[PDB]
Amino acid sequence: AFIAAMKGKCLLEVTGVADPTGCGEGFSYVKIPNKDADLRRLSLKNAKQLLRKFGVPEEEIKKLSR
DNA sequence: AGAAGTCTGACATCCTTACTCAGCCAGCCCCACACTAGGCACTGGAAGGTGAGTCACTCTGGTGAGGCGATTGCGATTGGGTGAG
């Protein structure tokens, strides 16, 4: 698994059971493959006011991307 | 004492009624178009509302690719049997 990952054949799940620590420290070398109706009726403006009400940050409110 | 501006007083004409019978107009009555100006109606234009179509986004379905994974095939190793010394 590790030598195949070094050639770029495949990837390795770095968290797994092959982990020699048994905790989150250390890697595991085993192969993984490399491979609304009423919401549309919010009619942008009221959805903007709803995002203001929930506490969504002003950047997302500002974008104005319906 | 001489002129002046009225002033009662003593006449002088053409109103009346009036025929009459002329020939021609002026002044009213009773309307004829006739006519002007604006009320009513019609037409046109503008505005507003509704309906339809299009655009964008999201969801669902279909197709493709992968995917891992089992199954099959091949190769290698081990064991057993037979033959030879």
UniProtKB/Swiss-Prot annotation:
Signal peptide segment: none
UniProt subcellular location: Nucleus
UniProt modification remark: Phosphorylated by casein kinase II in vitro.
Domains: entry comment: The Bromo domain mediates interaction with histones that have acetylated lysine residues at specific positions. The second domain also recognizes and binds histones that are butyrylated and crotonylated.
Family of this protein: Belongs to the TAF1 family.
Illness association: Dystonia 3, torsion, X-linked: An X-linked dystonia-parkinsonism disorder. Dystonia is defined by the presence of sustained involuntary muscle contractions, often leading to abnormal postures. DYT3 is characterized by severe progressive torsion dystonia followed by parkinsonism. It has a well-defined pathology of extensive neuronal loss and mosaic gliosis in the striatum (caudate nucleus and putamen) which appears to resemble that in Huntington disease.
Primary role: The TFIID basal transcription factor complex plays a major role in the initiation of RNA polymerase II (Pol II)-dependent transcription. TFIID recognizes and binds promoters with or without a TATA box via its subunit TBP, a TATA-box-binding protein, and promotes assembly of the pre-initiation complex (PIC). The TFIID complex consists of TBP and TBP-associated factors (TAFs), including TAF1, TAF2, TAF3, TAF4, TAF5, TAF6, TAF7, TAF8, TAF9, TAF10, TAF11, TAF12 and TAF13. TAF1 is the largest component and core scaffold of the TFIID complex, involved in nucleating complex assembly.
SUBUNIT field: Component of the TFIID basal transcription factor complex, composed of TATA-box-binding protein TBP, and a number of TBP-associated factors (TAFs), including TAF1, TAF2, TAF3, TAF4, TAF5, TAF6, TAF7, TAF8, TAF9, TAF10, TAF11, TAF12 and TAF13. Interacts with TAF7; the interaction is direct. TAF1, when part of the TFIID complex, interacts with C-terminus of TP53.
This protein's name: Transcription initiation factor TFIID subunit 1
Species: Homo sapiens (Human)
Gene: TAF1
Location of this fragment in the whole protein: 958 to 1043 of 1893
